[PDB]
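Anyone up for a design puzzle?
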């Protein structure tokens, strides 16, 4: 559906601040100024470092993604560079969030984020789409109770060895089941409050380490059931890994008894927001439809 992707002229938006960069592109806070208007509307803009016809084809796919837990591509500007326009998420990315709130995040939040990320990935799988680059740095925070996967389509439009399934490292094979491996690493990032996976180990050594049977270590707050889920995501046989629909169920179950599955100091005073505070967040900055968060029994 072409109506889902707005083609913008470079003249109707401006980049005002660098937010971050990767090997692939640079993300800016930008301002959209509608033609004829004086209002300046904040947006996110990513500029990547015949081809346009292939780019637009993928952009239409990225603009078709409609789910509470995956960010949708809203617009594109094709000049000498490709620029992607998306909704700005003022809370930023989840990796930064867990780092900046280290040991000050309740179990109910951590487990619900795991659910939401699995729901987003399950939606992509239902659409027959593979993400290929799931990582905490590519999950954004809409509100503390609402996270969303971003950077979908990046690979197909344009290498993170330490997030990749072994078969992806060795054979650059990407499937829903290799997405599950990366989901496992992403969960590990959350549960360690943003530790770097395989810290101090060169990327060139990762395949041999995995082949030896070594994996990321159990995070201190994780009980055995949570760690076993992670380990299952990192099995060599792709078909032996959990499915996203299974992950949704498991983390949803744990979210109903959060203190049973994660051990966090001071957890009893870090509950989900009250209905009052939840309604306030939604009214201000989250008016979109979404499944209710899983509360504790
Ligand atoms: C408030 O911060 C962000 C909001 C965002 N809102 C929406 N989208 C973002 N990323 C993004 C990702 C892919 C895209 F195609 C586009 Cl257009 C945008 C965003 C990235 C954002 O920050 C990215 C950089 C985070 N760095 C990580 C390193 O330490 C400094 C902070």
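Challenge accepted. My sequence:
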């Amino acid at each position: 559906n072409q109506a889902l992707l707005r083609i913008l002229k470079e003249t109707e938006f401006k980049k005002i601040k660098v937010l971050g960069s990767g090997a692939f592109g640079t993300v800016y806070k930008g301002l959209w100024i509608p033609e004829g208007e004086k209002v300046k509307i904040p947006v996110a803009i990513k500029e990547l470092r015949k081809a346009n016809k292939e780019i637009l084809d993928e952009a239409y796919v990225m603009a078709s993604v409609d789910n509470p837990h995956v960010c949708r591509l809203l617009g594109i500007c094709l000049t000498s560079t490709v620029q992607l326009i998306m909704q700005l998420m003022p809370f930023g990315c989840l990796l930064d969030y867990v780092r900046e709130h280290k040991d000050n995040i309740g179990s109910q939040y951590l487990l619900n984020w795991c659910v939401q990320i699995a729901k987003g990935m399950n939606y992509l799988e239902d659409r027959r789409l593979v993400h290929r680059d799931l990582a905490a740095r590519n999950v954004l925070v809409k509100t503390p109770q609402h996270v969303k996967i971003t950077d979908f389509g990046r690979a197909k439009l344009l290498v993170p060895i330490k997030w990749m399934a072994l078969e992806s490292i060795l054979h650059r094979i990407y499937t829903h089941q290799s997405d599950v491996w990366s989901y496992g690493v992403t969960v590990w990032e959350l549960m360690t409050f943003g530790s770097k996976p395989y810290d101090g180990i060169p990327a060139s050594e990762i395949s041999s380490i995995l082949e030896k049977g070594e994996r990321l270590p159990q995070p201190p707050i994780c009980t055995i059931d949570v760690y076993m889920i992670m380990r299952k995501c990192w099995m060599i046989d792709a078909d032996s890994r959990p499915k996203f629909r299974e992950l949704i169920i498991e983390f949803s179950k744990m979210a109903r008894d959060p203190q049973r599955y994660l051990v966090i100091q001071g957890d009893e005073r870090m509950h989900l927001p009250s209905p009052t505070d939840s309604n306030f967040y939604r009214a201000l900055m989250d008016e979109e439809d979404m499944d209710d968060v899983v509360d504790a029994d």
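A detail worth pointing out: Residues 107-126 form the longest helix (20 residues).
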